[PDB]
């Protein structure tokens, strides 16, 4: 096992959604090195590679999630913490 | 062209697999690559398999067949499908005893074919009742049956969400037939590992798909057989790995313990029986075997995490689960315990989340057992020469330990733990490596320890400073980091300030200890700045000769940051005097570089951090800015071609300006001139950003408003040229980003100056084109500008000039309003990711505040012009947006609506 700072929080999960359902949905983006769901239909997913997280935020956000029981919901996928710089070389810029 | 000659493909193959040279092996690869990409690939691969010269070429052919099926399946006429299936089945039949590495590739190909051939329904059934009776067919039939469920999650196949669901339940239907088949295989006397491994890998694979019946598997010989070979010492390493992986798969397949309790019970009891075999494996030096046991254990606790948490100790929550981990944790090899780290995180996270600390007391002893286990794992080798390196493989482990301790410490009590670790540090004549490791775990938690029980806390600090220099380098280092983490105890007990400082100063004067010391010094300066006016003499003296201590750039900056934080607390009178000395050492170093390899970055970064954090309350700094500007302007001008240096140059100037503010007006025009002249030949987008800062700082003063507008209009000419190029927006997102941060500062400091200008017309135009730019930073900057622009025709009606601004925006809205709304709606539905929706909604929102009735028409027109979607859906979306009373509702409307596309 291993962990990363390439983390997204997922929301709007059905209460019957398992971390295995979550991992199965998010693996479309890349390798999941840590996953977990909580009580309130919320979860975290950590990716081995940053670019795979970015894909998840871009492509898996607002998608149809189907739990193992068959419960469907449209989920929210966003980066946990301050977002990553978009492509191109880094620049120091004030934000918020 | 035409298909390559076989002699040629045979030549390229032998190179790729036997030619030691890198340049040639690469060349063969591309040609074989083009062969694979080509249409001839099918035919060549098929020939190579019929000829079956050797293992190499059959492997290349099998792989190519597989690749063409999982990427290029579309370019096959429907009629060809049945024949390709017949080829692959004949091929895997003929080549089954050639090499296993060839059978897998062909097996993979057949699986990829079945998943993509709806005309091949019931393929599992087809395959089994066709090959199960031939005893020599079984190894590749199992292989196909093994890779088929693995390929359902193939990123290489990327089957649609709906088609994938059909697939899985179709497979679920036949899971019995393969289990039945799987049972028959082991259903013999004295079966060898080779057959057993195929059975377990196959079973595990169908478990992972989540289509096996828990209730049928609970009472089934395969499970008993799994734990059986996992108990037997005689079993080989390879049979072990297969058996273990299948157990972890069985566990993983249990998603809800309640629905799969029979299976759950079977697995729980099964794994507890393995502790003897673990000890036997550790009795030998069979590390491969123990790693397997720790994974099975860790997977078990993961599976029953809910029960360990909700109802600990009782039944499913039987805490022997955790004990098995603590056994693994005691193992001298740290690669064993790190297997379990993710479970511990997840366990701690769950206990914390469900805040019912009534139960928490039961876990404390387990965590403190784990912590002591991790404490010894952090011990460096007694023959370690230097400081503890964080970069190496073991230093990585310590950090994962350090992080895990921070997250679990609440279950023990940070104070309880901190004191207890320190106590043990005089008993037993401890070797340096036992002290360091205890100091290390102490540093991990020293921040979270409550300063209420001050006596035990403040005496630990007193213990660390009385350590002699004679102690091991690594002990001096970690104690420096512990002290650094204990700045709040130096803040509450100011008498310890001078001893701590004196101790850190000693470490600073030794080369391999400097950075750790400088960081600790920075912490002290940051937390204890309130009363450190006395020590400033020393900090300044360090600064006067900073590059002598062999510091890292970061530790250096942090040091200067520290001294600047306390300079700001000094009496206002001495600030202006000391600040100039603080900067002079930098200015002198830069001055040398102008007459000098010359890279001014570090002194630019050191100047920048000084300004950034020399922030007193009143100004003394603008006096110093005059001293700085001439050397910066020449530095800037010398490296005006280099973006990286200029960017650091502008960063420095950004913070110098932010420090002062409306003062230091002596720099505005000479900087603007230099910026505009340089930007003319080198379009560094940070001049736009620097420009936005000057506008942010001097935009209200109407004396500067003309000069600032001239700056913008001058900067925009090479800017628009840039964005005018092919892929101009995509290639210069930094320019778009910084251009509209600039435009935004104008539109909120002096809007009318910008709106009545001629340059606003191209700016607005580029904004509308920029709304479809798929670049998050640049797009935020654009949406923000549009929002702030349109809001100007609504904002602050209390001031006089409101009616003028009202008219200017109305014109803009008249001219462009309907095109913007169409663009915004376009980017949401087709171009950009869902995270842009809240930014779009805010622009749309401002348009309603300006003229909702016109907007209702505009939006209606936009929804009218759309290239699957019912008229009812367009209507109620229009209904949702226009009837929104909060901005939030437009976003929800877009969120929902976007899904339709």
Curated annotation (Swiss-Prot), chain A:
Q: Where in the cell is it found?
A: Cytoplasm; Nucleus speckle
Q: List-wise, which residues carry Phosphoserine?
A: 18, 84, 86, 90, 92, 94
Q: What is the effect of changing residue 68 to R?
A: In NEDFBA; uncertain significance
| Entry-annotated residues carrying Phosphotyrosine | 87
Q: At which residues is N6-acetyllysine found?
A: 64
Which positions fall inside the RRM domain? Answer: 6-80
Recount the PTM note: Phosphorylated by CLK1, CLK2, CLK3 and CLK4. Phosphorylated by SRPK1 at multiple serines in its RS domain via a directional (C-terminal to N-terminal) and a dual-track mechanism incorporating both processive phosphorylation (in which the kinase stays attached to the substrate after each round of phosphorylation) and distributive phosphorylation steps (in which the kinase and substrate dissociate after each phosphorylation event).
Top-rank taxon: Eukaryota
| Medical condition linked | Neurodevelopmental disorder with dysmorphic facies and behavioral abnormalities: An autosomal dominant disorder characterized by developmental delay, intellectual disability, speech delay, hypotonia, behavioral abnormalities, and non-specific dysmorphic facial features. Some patients have variable skeletal and cardiac anomalies.
- Record note on quaternary structure: Consists of two polypeptides of p32 and p33. Identified in the spliceosome C complex. Component of a ribonucleoprotein complex containing mRNAs and RNA-binding proteins including DDX5, HNRNPH2 and SRSF1 as well as splicing regulator ARVCF. In vitro, self-associates and binds SRSF2, SNRNP70 and U2AF1 but not U2AF2. Binds SREK1/SFRS12. Interacts with SAFB/SAFB1. Interacts with PSIP1/LEDGF. Interacts with RSRC1 (via Arg/Ser-rich domain). Interacts with ZRSR2/U2AF1-RS2. Interacts with CCDC55 (via C-terminus).
Role of this protein = Plays a role in preventing exon skipping, ensuring the accuracy of splicing and regulating alternative splicing. Interacts with other spliceosomal components, via the RS domains, to form a bridge between the 5'- and 3'-splice site binding components, U1 snRNP and U2AF. Can stimulate binding of U1 snRNP to a 5'-splice site-containing pre-mRNA. Binds to purine-rich RNA sequences, either the octamer, 5'-RGAAGAAC-3' (r=A or G) or the decamers, AGGACAGAGC/AGGACGAAGC. Binds preferentially to the 5'-CGAGGCG-3' motif in vitro.
Query: What is recorded about the protein's domains?
Result: The RRM 2 domain plays an important role in governing both the binding mode and the phosphorylation mechanism of the RS domain by SRPK1. RS domain and RRM 2 are uniquely positioned to initiate a highly directional (C-terminus to N-terminus) phosphorylation reaction in which the RS domain slides through an extended electronegative channel separating the docking groove of SRPK1 and the active site. RRM 2 binds toward the periphery of the active site and guides the directional phosphorylation mechanism. Both the RS domain and an RRM domain are required for nucleocytoplasmic shuttling.
Q: Which gene encodes it?
A: SRSF1
Curated annotation (Swiss-Prot), chain B:
A GO cellular component entry from the record: nucleoplasm
List, alphabetically, the InterPro entries matched: ARM-like, ARM-type_fold, Exportin-1/Importin-b-like, Importin_beta-like_NTR
Where expressed (tissues)?
A: Expressed in skeletal muscle.
The listed outcome for residue 651 to A is: Abolished interaction with SRSF1. In 9Ala; abolished interaction with SRSF1 and CPSF6 without affecting interaction with GTP-bound Ran
Any one GO MF term held by the record is: nuclear import signal receptor activity
Supply the SUPFAM superfamilies for this chain. Answer: ARM repeat
- Which UniProt keywords are present, listed alphabetically? Acetylation, Cytoplasm, Disease variant, Limb-girdle muscular dystrophy, Nucleus, Phosphoprotein, Protein transport, Transport
- Is tRNA-binding one of the keywords? no
Compartments, record wording: Nucleus envelope; Cytoplasm
- Name the principal localization, coarsely classed: nucleus
Residues modified as Phosphoserine: 72
Report the residues modified as Phosphothreonine.
875
* Keyword Protein biosynthesis recorded: no
- A Pfam entry, by short name: TPR_TNPO3_IPO13_2nd
Q: How does it assemble?
A: Interacts with (GTP-bound) Ran. Interacts with (phosphorylated) SFRS1 and SFRS2; leading to their nuclear import. Interacts with NUP62. Interacts with RBM4. Interacts with CPSF6, promoting its nuclear import. (Microbial infection) Interacts with the HIV-1 pre-integration complex (PIC), which is composed of viral genome, matrix protein, Vpr and integrase. Interacts with HIV-1 integrase protein; the interaction is direct.
Q: What does this protein do?
A: Importin, which transports target proteins into the nucleus. Specifically mediates the nuclear import of splicing factor serine/arginine (SR) proteins, such as RBM4, SFRS1 and SFRS2, by recognizing phosphorylated SR domains. Also mediates the nuclear import of serine/arginine (SR) protein CPSF6, independently of CPSF6 phosphorylation. The nuclear import process is regulated by the small GTPase Ran that partitions between cytoplasm and nucleus in the predominantly GDP- and GTP-bound form, respectively. (Microbial infection) Involved in immunodeficiency virus (HIV-1) infection by importing the pre-integration complex (PIC) into the nucleus. Required for a nuclear maturation step of HIV-1 prior to integration.
Which PANTHER family does the record associate with it? Answer: TRANSPORTIN 3 AND IMPORTIN 13, TRANSPORTIN-3
Q: Which disease is it linked to?
A: Muscular dystrophy, limb-girdle, autosomal dominant 2: An autosomal dominant myopathy characterized by proximal muscle weakness primarily affecting the lower limbs, but also affecting the upper limbs in most patients. Affected individuals also have distal muscle weakness of the hands and lower leg muscles. The disease has generally a benign clinical course but some individuals with childhood or juvenile onset manifest severe widespread myopathy, leading to wheelchair dependency and respiratory insufficiency.
Protein name, per record: Transportin-3
Q: Which organism is it from?
A: Homo sapiens (Human)
């Amino acid at each position: 096992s291993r962990r990363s700072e390439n983390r997204v929080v997922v929301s709007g999960l059905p209460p019957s959604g398992s971390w295995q359902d979550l991992k199965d949905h998010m693996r479309e983006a890349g390798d999941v090195c840590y996953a977990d769901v909580y009580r309130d239909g919320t979860g975290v997913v950590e990716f081995v590679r940053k670019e795979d997280m970015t894909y998840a935020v871009r492509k898996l956000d607002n998608t149809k999630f189907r739990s193992h029981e068959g419960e469907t919901a449209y989920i929210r996928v966003k980066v946990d913490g301050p977002r990553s710089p978009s492509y191109g070389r880094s620049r120091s810029r004030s934000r918020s | 062209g035409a298909k390559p000659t076989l002699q040629l493909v045979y030549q390229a193959v032998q190179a790729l697999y036997h030619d030691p040279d890198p340049s040639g092996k690469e060349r063969a690869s591309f040609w074989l690559g083009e062969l694979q990409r080509s249409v001839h690939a099918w035919e060549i691969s098929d020939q190579l398999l019929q000829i079956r010269q050797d293992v190499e070429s059959c492997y290349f052919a099998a792989q190519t067949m597989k690749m063409k099926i999982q990427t290029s399946f579309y370019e096959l006429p429907t009629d060809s499908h049945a024949s390709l299936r017949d080829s692959l089945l004949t091929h895997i039949q003929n080549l089954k005893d050639l090499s296993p590495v060839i059978v897998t590739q062909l097996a993979l190909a057949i699986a990829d074919l079945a998943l993509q051939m709806p005309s091949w329904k019931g393929c599992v059934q087809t395959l089994v009742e066709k090959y199960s009776n031939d005893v020599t067919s079984l190894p590749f039939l199992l292989e196909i049956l093994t890779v088929l469920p693995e390929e359902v999650h193939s990123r290489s196949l990327r089957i649609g969400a709906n088609r994938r669901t059909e697939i899985i339940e179709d497979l679920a239907f036949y899971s019995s037939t393969v289990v039945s088949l799987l049972m028959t295989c082991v259903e013999k006397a004295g079966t060898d590992e080779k057959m057993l491994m195929k059975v377990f890998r196959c079973l595990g694979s169908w478990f992972n798909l989540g289509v096996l019946d828990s209730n049928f598997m609970a009472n089934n010989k395969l499970l008993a057989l799994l734990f059986e070979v996992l108990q037997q010492d005689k079993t080989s390493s390879n049979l072990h790995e297969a058996a273990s992986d299948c157990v972890c798969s069985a566990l993983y397949a249990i998603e809800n313990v309640e629905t799969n309790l029979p299976l759950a019970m079977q697995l729980f009891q099964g794994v507890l029986t393995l502790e003897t075999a673990y000890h036997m494996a550790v009795a030998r030096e069979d590390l491969d075997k123990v790693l397997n046991y720790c994974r099975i254990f860790t997977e078990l606790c993961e599976t029953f995490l809910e029960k360990i948490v909700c109802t600990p100790g009782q039944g499913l929550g039987d805490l022997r689960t955790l004990e098995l981990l603590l056994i693994c944790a005691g193992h001298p090899q740290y690669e064993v315990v790190e297997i379990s780290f993710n479970f511990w995180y997840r366990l701690g996270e769950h206990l914390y989340k469900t805040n019912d600390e009534v139960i928490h007391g039961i876990f404390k002893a387990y965590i403190q057992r784990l912590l002591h286990a991790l404490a010894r794992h952090c011990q460096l080798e007694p023959d370690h020469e230097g400081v503890p390196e964080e970069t190496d493989d073991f230093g990585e482990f310590r950090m994962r330990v350090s992080d895990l301790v921070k997250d679990l410490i609440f279950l023990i009590g940070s104070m309880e733990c901190f004191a207890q670790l320190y106590s043990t540090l005089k008993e037993g004549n401890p070797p340096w490596e036992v002290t360091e490791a205890v100091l290390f775990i102490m540093a991990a938690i020293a921040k979270s320890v409550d300063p209420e029980n001050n006596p035990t806390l403040v005496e630990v600090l007193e213990g660390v400073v009385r350590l002699p220099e004679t102690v091991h380098t690594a002990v001096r280092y970690t104690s420096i980091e512990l002290v650094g983490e204990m700045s709040e105890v130096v803040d509450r007990n100011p008498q310890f300030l001078d001893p701590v400082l004196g101790y850190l100063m000693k470490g600073l004067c030794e080369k391999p200890l400097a950075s750790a010391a400088a960081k600790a010094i920075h912490n002290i300066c940051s937390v204890c700045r309130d009363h450190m006016a006395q020590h400033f003499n020393g900090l300044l003296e360090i600064a006067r000769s900073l590059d002598s201590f062999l510091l890292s750039p970061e530790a250096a900056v942090g040091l200067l940051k520290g001294t600047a934080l306390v300079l700001a607390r000094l009496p206002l009178d001495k600030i202006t005097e000391c600040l100039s000395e603080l900067c002079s050492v930098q200015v002198m170093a830069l001055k040398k570089l102008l007459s000098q390899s010359s890279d001014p970055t570090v002194f630019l970064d050191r100047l920048a951090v000084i300004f950034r954090h020399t922030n007193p309350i009143v100004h003394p700094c603008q006096k110093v800015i005059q001293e700085i500007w001439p050397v910066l302007s020449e530095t800037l001008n010398k490296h005006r071609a280099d973006n990286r240096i200029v960017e650091r140059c502008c960063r420095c100037l950004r913070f110098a300006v932010r420090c002062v503010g409306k003062g230091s007006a002596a720099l505005l025009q000479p900087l603007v001139t230099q910026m505009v002249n340089v930007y003319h030949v080198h379009q560094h987008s940070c001049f736009l950003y620097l420009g936005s800062i000057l506008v942010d700082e001097y935009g209200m003063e109407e004396g500067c408003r003309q000069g600032l507008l001239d700056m913008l209009q001058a900067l925009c000419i090479p800017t628009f040229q840039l964005l005018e190029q092919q892929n101009g927006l995509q290639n210069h997102p930094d320019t778009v980003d910084d251009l509209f941060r600039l435009a935004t500062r104008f539109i909120q400091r002096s809007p009318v100056t910008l709106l009545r200008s001629q340059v606003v017309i191209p700016i607005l135009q580029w904004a509308i084109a920029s709304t479809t730019l798929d670049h998050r930073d640049a797009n935020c900057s654009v949406m923000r500008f549009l929002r702030d622009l349109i809001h100007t025709g609504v904002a602050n009606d209390h001031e006089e000039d409101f009616e003028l601004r009202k008219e200017l925006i109305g014109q803009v809205m008249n001219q462009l309003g309907q095109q913007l709304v169409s663009q915004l709606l376009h980017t949401c539905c087709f171009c950009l990711p869902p995270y842009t929706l809240p930014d779009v909604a805010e622009v749309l929102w401002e348009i309603m505040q300006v003229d909702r009735p016109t907007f209702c028409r505009w939006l209606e027109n936009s929804l009218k012009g759309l290239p699957t979607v019912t008229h009812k859906q367009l209507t109620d979306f229009h209904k949702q947006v226009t009837s929104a009373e909060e901005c939030k509702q437009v976003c929800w409307a877009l969120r929902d609506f976007t899904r339709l596309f």
